[PDB]
Amino acid sequence: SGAIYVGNYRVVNRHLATHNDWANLVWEDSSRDLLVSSTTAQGCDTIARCDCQTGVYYCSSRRKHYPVSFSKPSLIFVEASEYYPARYQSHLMLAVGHSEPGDCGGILRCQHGVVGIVSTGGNGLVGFADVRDLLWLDEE
Ligand SMILES: Nc1ccc(-c2ncno2)cc1
Ligand SMILES: [Zn+2]
């Protein structure tokens, strides 16, 4: 699990979204495994606006932060999960690293802020759903 809190937005894995996330839906993209819901409390997270390909992600299954190199956001084929069928995911970044289902929502960050959240795992790769292109997260 895990979320990004920026302004009056909550960003979560679409597959881990709650009924309150869906009842307060702002935006969702099944292709990206992202959902944004509205919050009453102001979020203090900063979204990275950059093209960094290095950063640090939290891995709950190891209670550790790992530094990783990651690919630029791409359309990647992702195998079947306990949450999705084997399909293409857009705006996905891969790194060599440890990712289990419960690691989803772990934040990836660079010097500029939040880059994305863990979304995919397996074959010794971790996929992160990019958020840096969602410029609208940083106003009203
Ligand atoms: N009034 C509502 C609110 C949420 C949901 C829902 N969330 C996830 N799946 O269904 C359904 C009805
Ligand atoms: Zn950056």
UniProtKB/Swiss-Prot annotation:
**Which reactions fall under this protein's catalytic activity?**
Selective cleavage of Tyr-|-Gly bond in the picornavirus polyprotein
Q: Which domain of life is it from?
A: Viruses
Q: Binding of Zn(2+) 1: at which residues?
A: 50, 52, 110, 112
Active site location: 15 (for protease 2a activity), 33 (for protease 2a activity), 104 (for protease 2a activity)
Q: What does this protein do?
A: Cysteine protease that cleaves viral polyprotein and specific host proteins. It is responsible for the autocatalytic cleavage between the P1 and P2 regions, which is the first cleavage occurring in the polyprotein. Also cleaves the host translation initiation factor EIF4G1, in order to shut down the capped cellular mRNA translation. Inhibits the host nucleus-cytoplasm protein and RNA trafficking by cleaving host members of the nuclear pores. Counteracts stress granule formation probably by antagonizing its assembly or promoting its dissassembly.
Quaternary structure annotation from Swiss-Prot or TrEMBL: Homodimer.
- Could you tell me what this protein is called? Protease 2A
Q: Which residues of the full protein are shown?
A: 869 to 1008 of 2193
